[PDB]
Paper text:
The TRAPP complexes are nucleotide exchange factors that play essential roles in membrane traffic and autophagy. TRAPPII activates Rab11, and TRAPPIII activates Rab1, with the two complexes sharing a core of small subunits that affect nucleotide exchange but being distinguished by specific large subunits that are essential for activity in vivo. We report a cryo‐EM structure of the entire Drosophila TRAPPIII complex. The TRAPPIII‐specific subunits TRAPPC8 and TRAPPC11 hold the catalytic core like a pair of tongs, with TRAPPC12 and TRAPPC13 positioned at the joint between them.
However, in the regions of TRAPPC8 and TRAPPC11 located on either side of the core the local resolution was suitable for de novo model building. An α‐solenoid is also seen for TRAPPC11, with residues 181–566 forming fifteen α‐helices that includes the interaction surface with TRAPPC2L. This region of TRAPPC11 has been referred to as the “foie gras domain” after the zebrafish gene in which it was first analysed as it was noted to be particularly well conserved between species (Pfam domain PF11817). The N‐terminal part of TRAPPC11 (residues 1–180) consists of four β‐strands interspersed with four α‐helices. The C‐terminal part (residues 567–1,320) is less well resolved but forms the arm connecting to the vertex with TRAPPC12 and TRAPPC13. The surface of interaction between TRAPPC2L and TRAPPC11 has a total area of 558 Å. The overall arrangement of the interaction is similar to that of TRAPPC2 and TRAPPC8. As was seen with TRAPPC2, α‐helix 1 of TRAPPC2L is central to the interface and interacts with α‐helices 14 and 15 of the TRAPPC11 α‐solenoid. We could identify two conserved regions in TRAPPC11 that are involved in the interaction. α‐helix 14 (Tyr442 to Ile453) contacts TRAPPC2L between Asn33 and Lys42. The other region is between residues Asp478 to Thr486 at the end of α‐helix 15, where residues such as Trp484 contact TRAPPC2L α‐helix 1 and the loop between β‐strands 1 and 2, similar to TRAPPC8 and TRAPPC2.
Residue numbers in the entry: 1 to 60, 76 to 377, 406 to 566, 579 to 626, 676 to 718
Write the structure that this text describes.
């Protein structure tokens, strides 16, 4: 009829490769088969240029398509069914035990040809003539034993191959691979012809079976490296899907199929390096899809799948990087990494909506749809969101794009906020806030500042909390004055260590958590000036440091401190007595204080605001 091409992801993520089989071989031989398999794993030892694509696997109206009709047929074709069958055996040249070799290899090839009769596959046999090498044209018993084979089965002579000694076995394995390339491409072409002949007939114009056929056609082509032909048959299948009706119960499956198709064709793009072509196909179909659905769209569908769309395309971005293309990433390291990240954000928001529509009183299996939601309720951790953010983070960091990755970092911390996970949010914010002050732009600086307020109060890193709060009061004039007053009260509280006021948010658990704090914690702008330095060991300096408050609200005028320095030798507007210098120290030392540390109101500004000298 019109059955799905496949509902199976995680398929052929690596470059698809042929498979030729090896039978169930016992441990008794596996040791020497080790060497045997070594040559086989030699395909994985050698460079891709030397490496043959094929690998190994083990086993013990109109008429309906055979080999195409179902997606498990596709997959079983992919790896379960080898294009060619090869059974490796040993052949010691002897007299009558070698006749027993004849009978035994006859039995095994009889079983093998029965299996082939099940599944229409070409066969080859490999024999180690473990004896010493001899010239070709010497062993008539080779012909005799081939004839014993043929009367048993009829396998052609040339399909027989020999790997006498390991030092010989290696080269004979290389040419084995070459011959296998031969037969494998032969079988692949034969199946290609099968598909095209199938496609020339319609079972009463079902029109979707042929879609499966052209899909499998692309499979064949990419097996045979004709990437262009197969990718364009894929795209033609996309066109065919377009011709199909939309918005039915199928349209979601249509969208997923087109996702498969976009995946494959974009692979074949970047293999052929047609970048903007891949971009155009990507967009074209994805906005097709956004149009095609207006609802249901429970938005773990067509939104999460949108996320997976950008996920696969990011996969193909990194695939290009492994290939080495710098184009789109000089443009945008991952155009779609963070994009899929915001798509999983909308995923989670839609999940919140799902909970909302659930909070309604919540017969065509809508409960299963609700059960869908329950399934969708599972993928609500949104930690995978955080990880996708991490990949986008690193991906943009690849070309050292600090700003963008930093703002994705504040994204991460915001998400941890949404999840209620204050800790690591606070960590990333702790990194960002000095950065944001370095960007000098106070607006978002303050916005992440109140975010940090929430983060630290929830965490209880009240040292960090108050540091951000105080550099916030520095220039908090963009915010409410009364909240400045409240926060200043919080400042005196924390300096005393007594619980801070924003109990309007606080709940007792984290409250106690930070009550634990500050037992360990150990430690608006004004100006420093000098009337005289570099003295003649007679001068007397004095308070040239103008203590200015740029906060509208005052801080309680408590007290003062000055800290002595040792270079060379050891020795609105509010001003009050300090007599900072009356100690007649030694000459030519400019004691410029690291930080002010006078006791106005409380200890200090601590967060790194102190000037040098005159």
């Amino acid at each position: 009829m019109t059955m799905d091409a496949t509902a199976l992801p995680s398929e052929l993520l690596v470059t698809p490769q042929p498979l030729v089989g090896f039978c169930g071989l016992d441990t008794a031989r596996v040791s020497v088969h080790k060497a045997v398999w070594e040559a086989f794993s030699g395909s994985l030892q050698r460079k891709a240029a030397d490496r043959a694509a094929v690998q190994y696997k083990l086993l013990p109206e109109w008429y309906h398509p055979k080999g195409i009709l179902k997606r498990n047929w596709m997959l079983k074709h992919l790896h379960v069914l080898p294009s060619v069958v090869v059974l490796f055996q040993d052949m010691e040249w002897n007299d009558l035990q070698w006749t027993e070799k004849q009978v035994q290899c006859a039995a095994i090839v009889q079983a093998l040809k029965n299996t082939l009769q099940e599944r229409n596959t070409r066969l080859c046999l490999v024999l180690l003539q473990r004896a010493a090498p001899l010239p070709p044209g010497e062993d008539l018993l080779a012909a005799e034993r081939a004839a014993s084979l043929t009367n048993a089965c009829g396998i052609t002579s040339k399909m027989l191959f020999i790997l006498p000694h390991t030092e010989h076995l290696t080269g004979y394995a290389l040419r084995l691979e070459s011959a296998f390339l031969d037969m494998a491409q032969s079988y692949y072409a034969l199946m290609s012809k099968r598909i095209r002949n199938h496609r020339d007939q319609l079972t009463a114009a079902h029109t979707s079976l042929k879609i499966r056929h052209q899909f499998k056609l692309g499979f064949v082509a990419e097996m045979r490296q004709d990437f262009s032909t197969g990718q364009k048959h894929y795209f033609q299948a996309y066109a065919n899907l377009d011709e199909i009706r939309i918005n039915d119960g199928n349209c979601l499956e249509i969208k997923t199929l087109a996702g498969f198709l976009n995946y494959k064709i974009c692979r074949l793009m970047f293999k052929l390096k047609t970048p903007r072509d891949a971009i155009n196909q990507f967009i074209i179909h994805v906005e097709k899809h956004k149009s095609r659905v207006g609802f249901k769209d429970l938005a773990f569908e067509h939104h999460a799948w949108l996320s997976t769309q950008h996920s696969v395309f990011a996969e193909l971005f990194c695939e290009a990087i492994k290939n080495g293309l710098p184009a789109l990433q000089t443009q945008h390291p991952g155009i779609y990494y963070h994009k899929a990240a915001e798509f999983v954000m909308k995923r989670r928001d839609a999940a919140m909506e799902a909970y909302a529509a659930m909070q309604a009183s919540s017969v065509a299996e809508q409960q299963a749809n609700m059960q869908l939601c329950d399934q969708e309720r599972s993928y609500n951790h949104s930690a995978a969101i955080i990880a996708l953010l991490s990949q986008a983070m690193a991906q943009f960091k690849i070309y050292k794009c600090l700003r963008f990755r930093k703002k994705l970092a504040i994204d991460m911390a915001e998400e941890y906020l949404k999840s209620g996970d204050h800790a690591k949010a606070l960590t990333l914010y702790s990194l960002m806030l000095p950065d944001y002050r370095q960007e000098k732009w106070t607006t978002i600086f303050t916005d992440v500042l109140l975010k940090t307020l929430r983060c630290a109060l929830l965490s209880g890193s009240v040292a960090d909390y108050i540091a951000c709060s105080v550099e916030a009061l520095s220039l908090r004039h963009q915010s409410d004055q009364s909240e400045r007053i409240l926060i200043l009260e919080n400042l005196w509280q924390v300096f005393q260590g007594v619980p801070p006021m924003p109990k309007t948010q606080l709940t007792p658990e984290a409250q106690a958590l930070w009550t634990s704090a500050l037992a360990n914690v150990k430690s608006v702008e004004m100006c420093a000036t000098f009337e005289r330095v570099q003295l003649s060991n007679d001068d007397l300096l004095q308070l040239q440091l103008i203590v200015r408050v740029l906060t509208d609200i005052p801080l309680r005028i408590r007290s003062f401190h000055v800290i002595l320095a040792d270079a060379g030798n050891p020795q609105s507007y509010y001003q009050l007595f300090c007599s900072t210098e009356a100690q007649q120290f030694h000459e030519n030392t400019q004691l410029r204080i690291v930080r002010l540390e006078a006791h106005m109101g409380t200890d200090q500004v601590a967060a790194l605001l102190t000037c040098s000298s005159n």
